[PDB]
Amino acid sequence: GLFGAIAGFIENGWEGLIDGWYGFRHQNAQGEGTAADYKSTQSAIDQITGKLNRLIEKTNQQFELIDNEFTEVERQIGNVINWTRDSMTEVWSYNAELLVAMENQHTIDLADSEMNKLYERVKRQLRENAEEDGTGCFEIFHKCDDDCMASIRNNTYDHSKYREEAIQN
Amino acid sequence: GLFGAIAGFIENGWEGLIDGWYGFRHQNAQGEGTAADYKSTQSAIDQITGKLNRLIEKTNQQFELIDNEFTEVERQIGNVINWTRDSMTEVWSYNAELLVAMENQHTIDLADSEMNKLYERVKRQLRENAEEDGTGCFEIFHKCDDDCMASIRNNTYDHSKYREEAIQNRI
Amino acid sequence: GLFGAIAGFIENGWEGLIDGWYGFRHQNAQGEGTAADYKSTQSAIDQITGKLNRLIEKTNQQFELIDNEFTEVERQIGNVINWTRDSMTEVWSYNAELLVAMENQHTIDLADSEMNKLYERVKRQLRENAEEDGTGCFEIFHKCDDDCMASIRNNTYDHSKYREEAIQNR
Amino acid sequence: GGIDKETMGFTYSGIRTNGTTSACRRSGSSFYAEMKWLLSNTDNAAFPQMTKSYKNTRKDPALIIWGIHHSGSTTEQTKLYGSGNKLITVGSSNYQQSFVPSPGARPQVNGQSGRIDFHWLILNPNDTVTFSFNGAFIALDRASFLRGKSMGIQSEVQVDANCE
Amino acid sequence: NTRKDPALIIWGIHHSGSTTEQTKLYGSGNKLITVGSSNYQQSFVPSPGARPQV
Amino acid sequence: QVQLVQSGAEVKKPGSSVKVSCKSSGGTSNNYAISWVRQAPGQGLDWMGGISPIFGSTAYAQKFQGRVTISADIFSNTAYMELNSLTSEDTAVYFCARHGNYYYYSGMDVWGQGTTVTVSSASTKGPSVFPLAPGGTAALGCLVKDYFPEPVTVSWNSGALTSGVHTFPAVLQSSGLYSLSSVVTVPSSSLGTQTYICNVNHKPSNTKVDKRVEP
Amino acid sequence: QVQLVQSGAEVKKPGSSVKVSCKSSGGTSNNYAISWVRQAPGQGLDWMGGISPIFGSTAYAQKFQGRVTISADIFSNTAYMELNSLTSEDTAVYFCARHGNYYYYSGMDVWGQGTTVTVSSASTKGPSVFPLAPGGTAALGCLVKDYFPEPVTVSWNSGALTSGVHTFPAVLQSSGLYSLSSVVTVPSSSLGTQTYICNVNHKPSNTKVDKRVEP
């Protein structure tokens, strides 16, 4: 929710979009077409994986029994051992739940962020030939074909080719 | 400071705005009017409350005396107990101050974020009929009345009704 | 990477820019000029320093020997001591690496943020007299001189002085 | 990491060395395999004042055990070790303790009224243990050296050599 | 302890090298040392007999 | 679904203070404003003030300023109202209510069950119970005299007789004590056969009386 | 407010090195540039270089490049200047100063009290202190003889007497040693009652001497 994109001004996601986290749905003369963006999908996924590899780590740290399940140790040192162990259970448990909550906050906002980085980029491509309607869409003020879409997608769309055209409108 | 809104390009806040965190102050023909936004105020407040409910939690975890304040325990085990308890004091104190500082950073930027989400939305509503002056204001390039303001507020203002009007009026 | 500025749509940084983190490179009629922005450079630096002063703190907390390197303590209490100390080593080591990774994420995104706050500000200044090309540049649509540059820099550039001029040119 | 046993090189004059008991059955009465139960030469005889010492000449620390025998009755003590007060002392450079047996009546466990209490110490490379005693003393025949490193666990379930 | 801070108190039990040496030093018969305060109570019997020489 | 549950009825002497609680169960109300509204006997709703504890606002009606304390414990999901220097003008039912949002303009859509506060100089006193002796049908009952405070429960035949029972609301005497009556209407034929006993329980004085009513 | 406290006066032989410190007290200077600036006797100010330790910049004047090392310990809030291969040309007062921002362009608005560094063949020596014996007012003082290097400090009556005290600048003898006088002006009536003692402290030779001046 940090950046306003996901669950903000984009109304929802597309359960039909199997092949990415982020993509394009267009409407022009010829037809309607959908394709998921690679460069930014990869980008997010990669930050998630880089998080995982940090946690699914194995501690190389070994511990032994100070304790005895078969013949109980003497009661005073038994009680010190138990009290220390519970205190460690407290620390680790707090650490576990905090670590996970915080990673989650950050993961969600990582996603909001990459959406709102796709948007703001395409916007930048199109200069003055279209408009922010505000539901995560661009109204194009010139007729455009399906090879014009692809040129937006793979980031080649030239503006000053369609400038004047799109301007009286 | 993360997003640039609060203590950024908005110069300050409004001590007269009792009824919200975020709101509107307008100037038109009729008069000057102020009203605070609900939809985004609620939004921030709810995230603050969701933080609180998490910390104001009670540990269901019980501890007993390993120690004796009346007749001191034997001295060596006394020394191990004290050293452990102090070590726990170190860890928890660090945890306390870190947790609180971090929650604070996040709370502040949570606020910056919601402001700069009010802004960017209103901006989006108005399309091509007004301009960013940059002190957290929109100069409207058409005459507008107090029922036009309300339509911006509760998010109904139609652009292509005032489009041409306000467009020639920028040359 | 959070905001898209640094290592995003700005392609890279300027190894010639000694006197700041953030600055200006302009091209007009007269020549080409570079000067680093103070207000936002200072701004970031100050947040980094405020991070440091917090960690570079000294614990006022004293600990004594419970242990003996010369004549070993009795073995059962020795083993409890060692096991506890190791457990503390676990906690602190985790805390250390977590604290540092997290501060680093935040430092990086702190930087992305201040860049993308310089940008969005200059943009706001110029109103309708220029355009986002999208590599961290503004194409100015009116001829402008080097005292016009300085007036953008120290934040005095008036728009409605050059408005009409730059608008037909669009 | 397991243990490796070495002889302590004790030999004994003018006592017995082969006291056994029906509670450790091998083929008839036997005893702890790594220990020697030291007894007077004949029933009631005086057990001599003995000193036995062992130097750890290896490069790793040695583990040393011995036992004090608490007979089931005072009569049984004097029969085994002769009459009079008994004292065992054990010394090295980081250790110093003495032991007096306490003979007298306990319930029978494994058909025995006596008890043995084992004590142990770590002997550092180049240090020497000295035992001195005039009875009620269970002597080690072998010292133990630790082999390396291992983990020890307590378990109630089967072993499986297929999973890691 | 009439001072205002706690006092550290030491004493030793002597274990003679032979029973003969104990009675020479201290006379024959059973020896007993007791030590009491309001938070302490213990007793000690020497155990005379042969240790190596140190 | 959040419910607001208030603390129980209070009986207070003039000049004392009363502190009523309002617990939010089934969810928190900390992100909303909660108001306190009182209703004097036979009178209308009257706003006392409110609190929106996360927002950080506490508000008071001018007419109660300085005499009322509104507060909240966000951790127990509870709001409180303390009214000081009580008089009989303060005898009323007190409600807490949650607004549709964090402030006091929105309609109040969730209400507590109310807490009765009675300011009186009366002392606890158990009732003295007397029989009311009696065609087709007959009328017999019990008079429950001079007790304080409300309530009293009356049953017939240990609760065995429920039909035709009409327990009248108590009168509040000028003494400050209450009196009520319970009358049961019964076939007069079953007069000399079925026995009739009223059982009167007054929790506050721990009084429990059975009383036989004969023709 | 921050103060920058530099280290003591230094006496050095030719070819040696000196490291002067500048401690930021009453707050941190870690977010600013601190420069080192020296002043040779009778000459003008001369920049040596600077450091801005959080920013990550250390800068050096070309004329001192390679012979000076500037550094900082952000943790003790201290900056340092080490100058190597000393000759008599380096005898001079070194000043640390703080810049109004993170870099070296801004005017330096805080400064150090200065460190004197003397590079010579002459050896350290503590002073021999002699009394100067004395109407309305009288003049009595102490002669502080044959010391090296500067500074000495003179106090009177264990710093209880600050009024009327005039410590004159030292005269550098042809021998290479200094001498100064301190005279205090005092009511002559308080001659046979109050005791006047002059305390001379010479740090470089670690010399403390208290002399009693008598009439």
Side-chain angles (χ1 to χ4, degrees):
Chain A
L2 249 219
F3 291 90
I6 309 176
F9 71 82
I10 293 92
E11 238 156 345
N12 66 342
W14 305 323
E15 288 166 41
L17 182 64
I18 35 163
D19 258 324
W21 289 24
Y22 306 109
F24 298 107
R25 200 171 271 172
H26 63 49
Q27 192 145 345
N28 70 327
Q30 308 189 214
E32 212 187 332
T34 269
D37 194 43
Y38 169 93
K39 207 256 198 179
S40 62
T41 267
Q42 200 53 66
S43 178
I45 295 195
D46 269 6
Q47 283 164 85
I48 265 58
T49 311
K51 257 172 189 204
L52 262 33
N53 287 346
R54 207 181 28 102
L55 314 177
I56 269 54
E57 205 114 16
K58 287 152 109 74
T59 40
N60 202 55
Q61 206 174 351
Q62 214 186 72
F63 287 96
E64 318 255 314
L65 265 2
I66 32 58
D67 227 346
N68 201 311
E69 192 170 348
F70 292 166
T71 17
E72 228 192 337
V73 306
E74 284 285 310
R75 189 71 63 155
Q76 187 167 32
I77 203 88
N79 290 338
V80 177
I81 298 155
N82 277 13
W83 164 81
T84 308
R85 173 186 296 126
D86 292 343
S87 304
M88 301 297 302
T89 303
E90 271 249 276
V91 178
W92 285 107
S93 303
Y94 163 94
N95 285 340
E97 189 158 350
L98 180 51
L99 164 72
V100 165
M102 189 218 95
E103 299 291 335
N104 286 352
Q105 201 63 47
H106 190 261
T107 279
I108 284 171
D109 296 332
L110 208 26
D112 209 38
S113 159
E114 283 276 331
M115 185 87 276
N116 189 62
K117 276 178 63 175
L118 201 56
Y119 194 86
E120 295 225 67
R121 178 236 286 171
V122 158
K123 182 226 218 285
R124 271 194 210 86
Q125 262 171 238
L126 305 175
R127 310 282 302 256
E128 207 75 278
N129 328 348
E131 265 190 66
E132 292 186 77
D133 62 333
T135 58
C137 286
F138 299 103
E139 280 183 51
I140 329 155
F141 281 122
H142 71 89
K143 257 211 166 92
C144 146
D145 41 322
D146 284 2
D147 277 278
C148 141
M149 296 309 187
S151 69
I152 316 166
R153 275 195 267 268
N154 62 45
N155 193 8
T156 59
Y157 168 90
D158 193 55
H159 70 297
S160 65
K161 197 200 164 176
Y162 306 123
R163 194 163 169 94
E164 276 79 5
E165 184 173 358
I167 291 180
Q168 201 214 11
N169 330 63
Chain B
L2 249 219
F3 291 90
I6 308 176
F9 71 82
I10 293 91
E11 238 156 344
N12 66 342
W14 304 323
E15 288 166 41
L17 182 65
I18 33 163
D19 258 323
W21 288 23
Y22 307 109
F24 298 107
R25 200 171 271 172
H26 63 49
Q27 191 145 345
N28 71 327
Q30 309 189 214
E32 211 187 332
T34 270
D37 194 43
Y38 169 95
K39 153 71 198 179
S40 62
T41 267
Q42 200 53 66
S43 178
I45 295 195
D46 269 6
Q47 283 165 85
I48 265 58
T49 311
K51 257 172 189 204
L52 262 33
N53 288 346
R54 207 181 29 102
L55 312 177
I56 271 54
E57 205 114 16
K58 287 152 109 74
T59 39
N60 202 56
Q61 207 173 351
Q62 213 186 72
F63 287 96
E64 319 255 314
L65 265 2
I66 33 58
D67 227 346
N68 201 311
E69 192 170 349
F70 293 165
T71 16
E72 228 191 337
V73 306
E74 284 285 310
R75 188 71 63 155
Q76 187 167 32
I77 203 88
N79 290 338
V80 179
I81 296 156
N82 277 13
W83 164 80
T84 309
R85 174 186 296 126
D86 292 343
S87 304
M88 300 296 302
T89 304
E90 271 249 276
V91 177
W92 285 107
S93 303
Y94 163 94
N95 285 340
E97 189 158 349
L98 180 51
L99 164 72
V100 164
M102 189 217 96
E103 300 292 335
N104 286 352
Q105 201 63 47
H106 189 261
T107 279
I108 284 171
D109 296 332
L110 208 26
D112 208 38
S113 159
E114 284 276 332
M115 184 87 276
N116 190 62
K117 276 178 63 175
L118 200 56
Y119 193 86
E120 294 225 67
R121 179 236 286 171
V122 159
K123 181 226 218 285
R124 271 194 210 86
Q125 262 171 238
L126 304 175
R127 310 282 302 256
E128 208 76 278
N129 329 347
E131 265 190 67
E132 291 186 76
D133 62 333
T135 59
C137 286
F138 298 103
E139 280 183 51
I140 330 155
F141 282 122
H142 71 89
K143 257 211 166 92
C144 146
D145 42 322
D146 284 2
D147 277 278
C148 141
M149 295 309 187
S151 69
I152 315 166
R153 275 195 268 268
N154 61 45
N155 193 8
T156 59
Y157 168 90
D158 193 55
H159 69 297
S160 65
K161 197 200 164 176
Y162 306 122
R163 194 163 169 94
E164 276 79 5
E165 184 173 359
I167 294 180
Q168 202 248 341
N169 291 345
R170 277 171 68 177
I171 344 284
Chain C
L2 249 219
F3 291 90
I6 307 176
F9 71 82
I10 294 91
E11 238 156 345
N12 66 342
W14 305 323
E15 288 166 41
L17 182 64
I18 34 163
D19 258 323
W21 288 23
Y22 307 109
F24 298 107
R25 199 171 271 172
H26 62 49
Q27 192 145 345
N28 70 327
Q30 308 189 214
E32 212 187 331
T34 269
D37 194 43
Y38 168 95
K39 265 188 200 179
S40 62
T41 267
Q42 200 53 66
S43 178
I45 296 195
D46 269 6
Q47 283 165 85
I48 264 58
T49 313
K51 258 172 189 204
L52 262 33
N53 288 346
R54 207 181 29 103
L55 312 177
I56 271 55
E57 205 114 16
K58 287 152 109 73
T59 40
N60 202 56
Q61 206 174 351
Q62 213 186 72
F63 287 95
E64 318 256 314
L65 265 2
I66 34 58
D67 227 346
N68 201 311
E69 192 170 349
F70 292 166
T71 17
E72 228 191 337
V73 307
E74 284 285 310
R75 188 71 63 155
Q76 188 167 32
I77 202 88
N79 290 338
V80 177
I81 297 156
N82 277 13
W83 164 81
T84 308
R85 174 186 296 126
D86 292 343
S87 304
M88 300 296 302
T89 303
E90 270 249 277
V91 177
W92 285 107
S93 303
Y94 163 94
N95 285 340
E97 189 158 349
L98 180 51
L99 164 72
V100 165
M102 189 217 96
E103 299 291 335
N104 286 352
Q105 201 63 47
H106 189 261
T107 279
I108 282 171
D109 296 332
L110 207 25
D112 208 38
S113 159
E114 284 276 332
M115 184 87 276
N116 190 62
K117 276 177 63 175
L118 201 56
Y119 193 86
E120 295 225 67
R121 178 236 286 171
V122 159
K123 181 226 218 285
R124 271 194 210 86
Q125 262 171 238
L126 304 175
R127 310 282 302 256
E128 208 75 278
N129 328 348
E131 265 190 67
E132 292 187 77
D133 62 333
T135 59
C137 286
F138 298 103
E139 280 182 51
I140 330 155
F141 282 122
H142 71 89
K143 257 211 166 92
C144 146
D145 41 322
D146 284 2
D147 277 278
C148 141
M149 295 309 187
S151 69
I152 314 166
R153 275 195 268 268
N154 62 45
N155 193 8
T156 58
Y157 168 91
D158 193 55
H159 70 297
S160 65
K161 197 200 164 176
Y162 306 123
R163 194 163 169 94
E164 276 79 5
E165 184 173 358
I167 294 180
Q168 201 249 131
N169 294 343
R170 280 172 68 177
Chain D
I3 64 210
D4 171 23
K5 291 247 162 49
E6 217 180 70
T7 176
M8 303 219 36
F10 296 149
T11 44
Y12 300 100
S13 277
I15 61 163
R16 261 130 88 201
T17 259
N18 60 5
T20 72
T21 161
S22 64
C24 323
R25 265 138 143 187
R26 268 175 196 96
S27 305
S29 303
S30 214
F31 199 59
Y32 296 90
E34 306 291 18
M35 311 300 278
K36 311 238 84 122
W37 194 342
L38 307 184
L39 259 36
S40 274
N41 222 36
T42 322
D43 298 345
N44 278 60
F47 190 106
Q49 188 67 49
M50 287 205 172
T51 298
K52 301 297 179 181
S53 60
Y54 168 77
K55 199 200 171 150
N56 177 355
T57 58
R58 277 164 75 144
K59 274 173 217 212
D60 279 359
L63 172 68
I64 306 281
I65 317 269
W66 65 94
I68 309 309
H69 180 231
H70 305 287
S71 311
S73 55
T74 56
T75 43
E76 189 66 7
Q77 180 166 295
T78 96
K79 162 178 153 79
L80 287 179
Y81 315 110
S83 47
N85 293 70
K86 307 305 192 184
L87 180 67
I88 296 78
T89 76
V90 182
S92 59
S93 287
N94 309 122
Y95 187 95
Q96 175 216 309
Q97 224 155 306
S98 73
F99 305 92
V100 193
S102 287
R106 285 104 169 143
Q108 290 203 286
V109 167
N110 282 294
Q112 299 311 331
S113 287
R115 297 294 186 264
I116 292 187
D117 297 351
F118 290 106
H119 298 79
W120 60 267
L121 79 79
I122 307 313
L123 228 202
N124 286 354
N126 230 52
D127 204 15
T128 302
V129 209
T130 309
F131 307 107
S132 345
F133 59 91
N134 61 339
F137 176 70
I138 302 308
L140 32 87
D141 208 65
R142 271 146 125 231
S144 300
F145 294 88
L146 311 188
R147 272 190 203 275
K149 230 215 144 286
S150 61
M151 218 185 311
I153 82 188
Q154 308 174 300
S155 165
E156 341 208 271
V157 291
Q158 300 197 357
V159 156
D160 195 5
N162 173 261
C163 49
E164 204 168 20
Chain E
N1 177 355
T2 58
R3 276 164 75 143
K4 276 117 218 211
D5 279 358
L8 171 68
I9 305 281
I10 314 269
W11 66 95
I13 308 309
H14 180 231
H15 305 287
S16 311
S18 55
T19 56
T20 43
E21 189 67 7
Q22 180 165 295
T23 96
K24 162 179 153 79
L25 287 179
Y26 316 110
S28 47
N30 294 71
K31 306 305 192 184
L32 180 68
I33 298 78
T34 77
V35 181
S37 59
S38 288
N39 309 122
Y40 186 94
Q41 175 216 310
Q42 224 155 306
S43 74
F44 305 93
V45 194
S47 287
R51 285 105 169 144
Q53 290 203 286
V54 167
Chain F
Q1 56 291 350
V2 167
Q3 288 190 29
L4 302 177
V5 178
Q6 303 183 214
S7 49
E10 302 268 0
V11 178
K12 295 285 178 177
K13 287 177 190 302
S16 63
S17 68
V18 62
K19 185 167 183 178
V20 179
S21 64
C22 174
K23 167 89 162 195
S24 181
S25 82
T28 190
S29 292
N30 292 339
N31 57 314
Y32 296 85
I34 285 185
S35 280
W36 289 97
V37 169
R38 81 169 182 192
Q39 183 167 44
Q43 308 293 316
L45 307 172
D46 197 11
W47 191 67
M48 301 185 77
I51 185 160
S52 186
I54 299 286
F55 179 56
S57 165
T58 307
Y60 295 105
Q62 289 177 357
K63 73 180 280 190
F64 292 106
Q65 186 82 58
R67 196 155 68 93
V68 64
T69 320
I70 287 168
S71 62
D73 182 344
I74 61 167
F75 314 121
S76 65
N77 291 326
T78 305
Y80 302 90
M81 192 277 306
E82 179 165 55
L83 182 63
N84 303 292
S85 302
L86 294 166
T87 72
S88 67
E89 292 173 17
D90 301 309
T91 292
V93 175
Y94 290 79
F95 296 99
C96 63
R98 192 176 84 174
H99 293 268
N101 78 345
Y102 72 92
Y103 213 71
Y104 315 107
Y105 308 148
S106 55
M108 300 173 282
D109 68 336
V110 187
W111 289 70
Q113 84 277 21
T115 299
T116 300
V117 177
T118 302
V119 180
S120 172
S121 64
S123 295
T124 306
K125 178 178 188 297
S128 297
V129 178
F130 298 110
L132 300 175
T137 56
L140 54 92
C142 282
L143 166 62
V144 180
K145 268 187 86 192
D146 293 328
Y147 67 91
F148 177 89
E150 291 274 48
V152 154
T153 64
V154 188
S155 64
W156 288 90
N157 296 3
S158 306
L161 178 60
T162 52
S163 73
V165 185
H166 187 7
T167 309
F168 285 70
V171 64
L172 173 58
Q173 303 157 231
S174 61
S175 65
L177 304 183
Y178 296 88
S179 285
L180 68 72
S181 296
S182 182
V183 51
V184 52
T185 300
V186 139
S188 44
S189 71
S190 90
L191 203 134
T193 38
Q194 169 75 255
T195 64
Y196 294 111
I197 303 173
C198 74
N199 325 109
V200 177
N201 194 27
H202 187 239
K203 291 193 231 155
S205 65
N206 196 85
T207 298
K208 177 52 177 58
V209 176
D210 301 311
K211 182 61 58 181
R212 187 180 183 149
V213 48
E214 293 166 359
Chain G
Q1 52 291 351
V2 163
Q3 300 200 26
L4 303 171
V5 180
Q6 302 184 214
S7 52
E10 303 268 0
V11 180
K12 295 285 178 176
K13 287 178 188 303
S16 63
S17 68
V18 62
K19 185 167 182 178
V20 179
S21 64
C22 174
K23 167 89 162 195
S24 180
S25 82
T28 192
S29 292
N30 293 339
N31 56 314
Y32 296 85
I34 285 185
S35 280
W36 289 96
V37 170
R38 81 169 182 193
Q39 183 167 44
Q43 308 293 316
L45 307 172
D46 197 11
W47 191 67
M48 301 186 77
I51 186 160
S52 186
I54 300 286
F55 178 56
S57 165
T58 306
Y60 295 107
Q62 290 177 357
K63 73 180 279 190
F64 292 104
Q65 186 83 58
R67 197 155 68 93
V68 66
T69 302
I70 288 167
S71 62
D73 182 344
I74 60 167
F75 313 118
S76 65
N77 291 326
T78 306
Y80 301 94
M81 192 277 305
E82 179 165 55
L83 182 63
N84 303 292
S85 304
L86 294 167
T87 73
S88 67
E89 292 174 17
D90 300 308
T91 289
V93 171
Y94 300 75
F95 291 94
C96 62
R98 194 174 85 176
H99 295 267
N101 76 340
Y102 77 87
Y103 213 71
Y104 315 109
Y105 305 148
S106 55
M108 300 171 281
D109 68 335
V110 185
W111 293 65
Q113 85 277 20
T115 301
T116 302
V117 174
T118 307
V119 180
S120 175
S121 62
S123 295
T124 304
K125 179 178 187 298
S128 297
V129 177
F130 298 112
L132 300 175
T137 56
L140 53 92
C142 282
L143 166 62
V144 181
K145 268 187 86 192
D146 293 328
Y147 67 91
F148 177 89
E150 287 272 48
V152 147
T153 39
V154 185
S155 62
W156 286 85
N157 288 4
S158 305
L161 176 63
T162 52
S163 73
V165 185
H166 187 7
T167 308
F168 285 70
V171 64
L172 173 60
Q173 299 163 228
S174 58
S175 64
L177 304 182
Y178 296 88
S179 285
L180 68 72
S181 296
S182 182
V183 49
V184 54
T185 300
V186 140
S188 44
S189 71
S190 90
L191 203 134
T193 38
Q194 169 74 255
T195 65
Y196 294 108
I197 305 172
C198 80
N199 330 107
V200 179
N201 188 26
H202 184 241
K203 287 195 232 154
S205 63
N206 198 87
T207 292
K208 183 49 175 54
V209 177
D210 309 308
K211 190 57 56 181
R212 181 187 179 153
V213 46
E214 290 170 359

